[PDB]
Design a protein around this ligand. Structure first.
Ligand SMILES: [Zn+2]
Ligand SMILES: [Zn+2]
Ligand SMILES: [Zn+2]
Ligand SMILES: [Zn+2]
Lengths: 8, 68
């Protein structure tokens, strides 16, 4: 799922 | 500003540009984006709350999801 920000 | 409802004020709640349920901007890494309405939801604000971000490609929020 999309998140507002991602680790990568 | 970017958001006309909160004028981007980091100290203000906004259910439009931040978590749609609590209005909080914290933990963007835990804010799921609805693949229908594009609103953000903390995993922990959902009912039921999720302990982690779902693995599946798409995610639909409580307002958009089909009846289970
Ligand atoms: Zn806003
Ligand atoms: Zn709503
Ligand atoms: Zn929230
Ligand atoms: Zn939605």
């Amino acid at each position: 799922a999309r998140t507002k920000q991602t680790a990568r | 500003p970017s958001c006309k409802h909160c004028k981007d004020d980091v100290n203000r709640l906004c259910r439009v540009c931040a978590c749609h349920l609590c209005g909080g901007r914290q933990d963007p890494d835990k804010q799921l984006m609805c693949d229908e309405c594009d609103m953000a939801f903390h995993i922990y604000c959902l009912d039921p709350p999720l302990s982690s971000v779902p693995s599946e490609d798409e995610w639909y929020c409580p307002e958009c999801r089909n009846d289970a």
